[PDB]
Amino acid sequence: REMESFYSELKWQEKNTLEEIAELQGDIRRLEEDLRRKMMNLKLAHTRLESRTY
Amino acid sequence: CLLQEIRQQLNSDHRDKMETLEIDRGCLSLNLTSPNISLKVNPTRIPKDSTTL
């Protein structure tokens, strides 16, 4: 009896952890493209800085 | 003769201001997703004349 109880509890817990991990992965990917956007903004800023030279 | 010199210096001023017009309006034109935008060498530099307002 106590065997079976242990087994069921562990299965449910690992399911939960799986879903959490998937969500985390998606989030990290998102932040990465956000970073790319910031670098493009910096390109814009430096070009606008340069333009006043002439 | 005095009026002649007045004329020429005002013409010089006119050309200067119109050049400034063109430069600033091109700057306004520049926007995101541009071909010539790039990281620049010491954009933080200061000019060598640095006239005040």
3-state secondary structure of B37: coil
Residues of B in contact with A50 (CB under 8 A): 40, 43
Method in brief: cryo-EM
Phi and psi at A49, nearest 5°, equal -60, -45
Number of H helices and E strands in chain A, helices first, is 1, 0
CB atoms A50 and B23 under 8 Å: no
CA separation, residue B31 to residues A3, A38, A44, B10, B44 (Å)? 67, 15, 7, 34, 20
Residues of A in contact with B28 (CB under 8 A): none
| Alpha helices (H) along chain B | 2-29
Query: Could you tell me if B27 and A51 are in contact, meaning their C-beta atoms sit under 8 angstroms apart?
Result: yes
CA separation, residue A25 to residues A2, A30, B3 (Å)? 36, 9, 76
Strands annotated E in chain A: none
> Which residues, other chains included, contact A48 with Cβ-Cβ below 8 Å and sequence gap of 6+?
B27, B30
What does the angle CA A35 – CA A43 – CA B50 come to, to the nearest 5 degrees?
A: 135
CB atoms A44 and B26 under 8 Å: no
Q: One-letter amino acid identity for B17?
A: K
